[PDB]
Design a protein around this ligand. Sequence first.
Ligand SMILES: Nc1ncnc2c1ncn2[C@@H]1O[C@H](COP(=O)(O)OP(=O)(O)NP(=O)(O)O)[C@@H](O)[C@H]1O
Ligand SMILES: Nc1ncnc2c1ncn2[C@@H]1O[C@H](COP(=O)(O)OP(=O)(O)NP(=O)(O)O)[C@@H](O)[C@H]1O
Ligand SMILES: Nc1c(C(=O)N[C@@H](CC(=O)O)C(=O)O)ncn1[C@@H]1O[C@H](COP(=O)(O)O)[C@@H](O)[C@H]1O
Ligand SMILES: Nc1c(C(=O)N[C@@H](CC(=O)O)C(=O)O)ncn1[C@@H]1O[C@H](COP(=O)(O)O)[C@@H](O)[C@H]1O
Ligand SMILES: [Mg+2]
Ligand SMILES: [Mg+2]
Ligand SMILES: [Mg+2]
Ligand SMILES: [Mg+2]
Lengths: 419, 419, 212
Amino acid sequence: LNIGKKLYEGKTKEVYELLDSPGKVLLQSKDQITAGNAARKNHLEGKAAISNKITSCIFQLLQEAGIKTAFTRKCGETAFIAPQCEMIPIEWVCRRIATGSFLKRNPGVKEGYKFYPPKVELFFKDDANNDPQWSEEQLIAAKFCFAGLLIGQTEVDIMSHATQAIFEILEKSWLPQNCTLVDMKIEFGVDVTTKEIVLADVIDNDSWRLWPSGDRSQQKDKQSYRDLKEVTPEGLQMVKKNFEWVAERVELLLKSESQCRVVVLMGSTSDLGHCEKIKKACGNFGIPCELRVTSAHKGPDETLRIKAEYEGDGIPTVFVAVAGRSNGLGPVMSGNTAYPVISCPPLTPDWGVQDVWSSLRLPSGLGCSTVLSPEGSAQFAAQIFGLSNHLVWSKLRASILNTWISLKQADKKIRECNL
Amino acid sequence: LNIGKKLYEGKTKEVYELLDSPGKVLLQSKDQITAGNAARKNHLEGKAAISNKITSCIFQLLQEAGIKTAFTRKCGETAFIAPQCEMIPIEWVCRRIATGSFLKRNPGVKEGYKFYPPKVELFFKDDANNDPQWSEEQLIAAKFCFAGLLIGQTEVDIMSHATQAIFEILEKSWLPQNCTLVDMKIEFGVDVTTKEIVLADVIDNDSWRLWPSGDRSQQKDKQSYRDLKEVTPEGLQMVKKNFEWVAERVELLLKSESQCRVVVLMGSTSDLGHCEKIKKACGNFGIPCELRVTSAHKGPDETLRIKAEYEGDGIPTVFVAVAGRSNGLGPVMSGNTAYPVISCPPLTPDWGVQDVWSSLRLPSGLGCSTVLSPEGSAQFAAQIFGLSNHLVWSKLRASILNTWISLKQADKKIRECNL
Amino acid sequence: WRLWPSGDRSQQKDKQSYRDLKEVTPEGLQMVKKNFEWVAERVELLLKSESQCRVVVLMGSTSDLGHCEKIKKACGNFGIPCELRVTSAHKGPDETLRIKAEYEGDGIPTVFVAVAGRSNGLGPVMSGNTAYPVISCPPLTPDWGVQDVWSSLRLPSGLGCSTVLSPEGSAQFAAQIFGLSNHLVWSKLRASILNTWISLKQADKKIRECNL
Ligand SMILES: Nc1ncnc2c1ncn2[C@@H]1O[C@H](COP(=O)(O)OP(=O)(O)NP(=O)(O)O)[C@@H](O)[C@H]1O
Ligand SMILES: Nc1ncnc2c1ncn2[C@@H]1O[C@H](COP(=O)(O)OP(=O)(O)NP(=O)(O)O)[C@@H](O)[C@H]1O
Ligand SMILES: Nc1c(C(=O)N[C@@H](CC(=O)O)C(=O)O)ncn1[C@@H]1O[C@H](COP(=O)(O)O)[C@@H](O)[C@H]1O
Ligand SMILES: Nc1c(C(=O)N[C@@H](CC(=O)O)C(=O)O)ncn1[C@@H]1O[C@H](COP(=O)(O)O)[C@@H](O)[C@H]1O
Ligand SMILES: [Mg+2]
Ligand SMILES: [Mg+2]
Ligand SMILES: [Mg+2]
Ligand SMILES: [Mg+2]
C-alpha cells in the first residue's frame, strides 16, 4: 500500500494521497472524541476502530442500496479508501423527531414533535460562528464551485432530496434492532474524477441520534458525551460502552431479516424472453427468481403440484403468471394459493387490447392483480417484499431518488439547448 | 353452570350434558397420559390443564381463521364447552415429513422425505386391530350415517381437503416459534344441531409431532413418552417439561408478529361507496383500513404530505388508489413511495373500457398494480400481508377451503334437480 | 387384462378363466383355449373404423387457400379425409346449396368448415340450410379481425353455427365431434392429451436445470 503526502488533518481524521491509485485517498481515523468549539476534547482508546467500522458498514449498506457514495473499501481496523472529493462546506441535517437545536431555534415546539416528511436543514461550516443555519437561497447565492461544478438550484435540490432518502434508508435499517434514528448530519462532495455530487466524509456515532426503544435516556450516540456537565474518567467509560454497543450491532444492518422469492410460471416456452426480463429485473432488487413451465389449460394437475412445492418449504413467495391469449394460469393460481399472484401477460399491439381482459375481469373470491410491464411486475414484487425486507426497501427508496436525479439532469441538459 | 348426566368417558376426557344449553356439552380433561393399545398409562398432575389450554388456544385460532370447529369457549383450567357432535370414527392424518407409521408401511422411504402437498391418510378407529389404514373407497362403502348425514363421496372429499387446510394453518402458525409441525391427527363429527361436518375432539400435544429447529431429538410432543424404553419417575418429569414447553408457547400462536394497514386514497367523496366496500372487506381479514380524500390533479402537494404521514410511522402499509376517469393518483403515488400501490378504479359500463387504460399503461419505473374488484383489492392487500402475518395468511387459507366446500354443496344441491 | 362380454364376469374371456380352475383337467384347458381363441378372433376388429368421417372446407375465395391447407393438413393428423371446395354465399348462393346437397346426400357423416374473410355469410347460410354441424373458421388478421369476427358470432335465432379461430383448432374440434362415434379418432385425441402433457413435464424439467 503506497502512502503519499498527508493532504490535511482535522480533529478525528488524517487524509493521505495514494500514489498507486489516481483520484483516491486514505482516511485514517484517530482515537480522539470532541464536541462544541471550546475545550471539550479527549483521548478515547478504540474510538478510531469503532468510527471506521460504523462508517465502513453504513457506506457499504448505502452503496449496495444504490446511493452514490465516496467509499471504495475498508483498509484495516482504523482506515478506509475513498474517492477524493472537493467537500461542499455544508452540514445537511435530517430530522424525524424534534430535539436538540430544532427546539432552541423554534421555542414552543415540544421534544417528540414528528416530521412527516422528515425535515431537511442546512448549516454553513464555520467554527467562528458555531455553524449558522443557511437557507437554500443563501447556498445558491454563494455561487460555490468545487472540482469545476457550480453549486446551483439543481445541485442544492439534489443534495436536499438525497439527504431525506439517506435518512429514510438508515431509519428503516435500524428499526429491526428496535432503535429509533431521531436525526443525522451528512456532508457531500464533488468526486474529482467523475464530477458527481456524492455522500462523503463519514457517517459514524457522532453523525446521528440513536434511541433504543425510542427512549432518549438510553441514547447510544455522541449526545451522551455532549450532555455530561463535567467529563470524568467514569463519564468517558460510559460514552465508550455506548460507542461499543453501536459497533457490536451495526454489521447486522447488512443482513436480510426475511427470505424473498419470485416464481414466474409461463404457459409456453415461446414467452421465455418476456420471463427472462422479469428474472433480470428481480436480480436488480437482490430477489431470487425461478422460471417454471406449466399450463392451466393442458396440465392443471401439474400447475397445482408445482404451486404446492413453493407453498410448502416456508419461503415467502410471489407468483408471477405469464400466459398469452386467454390467461387461465393467473386466475387458477390465484384461486388456489394464499400467496399473492401477479398476471404479467406478454401483450403485443396485435391482440393485446382483447387478451388483457382475461387477466382483469375475474369471478368473485380472486385477488389476482395485473401489471403489464415485465420490469414493473418485478418492481411490484420487490415493493411487496419491501414491507418485510429493509435491504429490498432501500433499493426501491434509492431508485426513486436516482430516477428523480436523472430527470433533473435531463432537464438541465435540454435547458442549455433553449438559448 | 348446570351440569347434567355423564354421557361418555374415555382414557383422557369425560363428556357431560348441559341442562340449560341445548346441543352443547362440557368436555372435562383428566390427569391421565396413555400410549398405544397396551399398558402404557400414567397419572400426570397438570396434564388435564395443559391439554385443555392447548386445544382451547388451537380451536380459537382455527375458529378465528374461519375453520368450522366444535368449540364454544374455555370453561376453567381443565374443561371446555363444545357443540355436541356424532363423531365419525376415522383418524385423519396429515404429513409434511415422512416418519412413524409412514416409514413402516412404505419400507425404502427415508425419514425426512417431504410431501408437496401434505399427505392425507385415513385410519379406522378400532384398538383391537391397532387402527388399520382405510382407503377413501372403504369409507364411502361403509355407508356411515351420523346425526342423519350419510357420509358419501362429497363428505369424504370435504374432510380430506379440510385436514390439509387445518394442517397448513397450524404449520404456518408454529413457524414463527422456530418449530416444525411434522404431522398431526384430527377427528371430525356431525354437529347434532346444524348437521355440518366440523373439526371436533381435541388438538393437543398428543395430536401432532413438534420439532424445534426441525430437530427430532428436541421433540416436544407425546412421542417423547411413546419412545421411553421403560417409564421411570425421572422419565415422566422430562415428558411433563416437554408438555409445559408447548403449554407456554401455544398462546403466542394467537398473537400477530407484524402490523398491517391499508390506506384507501380517493380523488372524490362521490367514490365513498366504493371505498366503504374496500374497508369492509379489509375488516374481514382483521387489517385496519383508513379512508383519506386527496386529488393528484388538484392537490398533488397534499397527496405527497398524506403519503409521508403513512410512510413515516413505522407501520407496513399498502395504498389503494380510487380515482374515476383519468387515474393520476395511482401513478403519482406509485412513483413517490417504496410501498405497494393498487389502483382500484370505480369503473361503470358507461366509460370503464376507456378509463381502465389510465391505470394499466404507465411510464417505465412504476410498479403500480391494477385490481378492478373492490373486495378483490382488499384480498390482494391481505395476500401481501399474509407473507408476514400468519393470522392474515390463515384467514386466506381457510377462505380457499370454505369457498371450495360451498361449490361442493351447491353441486350436491343442483344434482338432486337432475334425477 | 380382464375382459367381460356384456359386463358379465361369468363370460370372462381372459386368463382369469385359467387362474380360477380348482384343478387343471384336459377338458379345463380346452375351455381356456376357446376363450383365448375368442379374443384372438375379435382383437383385429379393434383396428377397424366402425363409422365414416369427412370434413368439407368451403372457402369464399382461393386467396384463403393457405388457411384451408392448414385445416386439411391437421385433419390428416386425425385420419379424417378432408375436401376443399370454392363457393361464395354472396355471389353464388344457388351453387353453395347444390355443393351442400352433394355432401348431405351420399350417406357419409360430414362436418362443414366455413372459411370466409370480412362479412362471413357462408357460415350462417350453410348453418341455416343443413342439419350437419357448421364451424366458421374465419381467416382473421390483426388489421380488421376484431371487426370481422362478429359476423361469425352474432347470428339470428335458429342457427347453431359455432366459431373456432384456430385452423388446427377447427380440425381438432371436427375430430372431437367424430370421436363420439369413431374409437380411432377418439384414441388419437386421447393420446395427444397425454403427449402434450408429457412435453410440458419435459420442458419444465429442462428449464429447472437453468435455475440452480
Ligand atoms: N472523500 C473525501 N475526499 C477528500 N476529503 C475528504 C473526504 N472525506 C472527508 N474529507 C475531508 O477530510 C477532512 C479531515 O476530516 P476531520 O478530521 O473529521 O475534519 P474536521 O476537523 O471534522 N474538519 P471539518 O469537517 O472541515 O469541520 C475534512 O475536512 C473533510 O472535508
Ligand atoms: N364435540 C364432541 N361432542 C361429543 N362427543 C365428543 C366431542 N368431542 C369428543 N367427543 C367424544 O368424547 C369421548 C371421550 O374422549 P376420550 O376420553 O379422549 O376418549 P378415547 O378414550 O380417546 N376414545 P376414542 O376417541 O373413541 O378412541 C370420545 O369418544 C369422543 O368421540
Ligand atoms: N454531529 C453533528 C454536528 C457536528 O458538528 N458535530 C460535532 C463536531 C464534530 O463532529 O467535530 C460536535 O460538535 O458534536 N452538527 C450536527 N450534528 C448531528 O446532527 C443532528 C442534529 O443535531 P442539532 O442540530 O440538533 O445539534 C444530530 O444527529 C447531531 O449529531
Ligand atoms: N396421536 C396419534 C394417534 C393416536 O391414536 N394417539 C394416541 C391414542 C391415544 O390417545 O391413546 C396414542 O396412542 O399415542 N394416531 C395418530 N396420531 C398422530 O398423528 C400423526 C400420525 O402418526 P403415525 O401414524 O405416524 O404414528 C402423529 O402426529 C401422531 O401423533
Ligand atoms: Mg453542526
Ligand atoms: Mg468532520
Ligand atoms: Mg392412531
Ligand atoms: Mg381421544
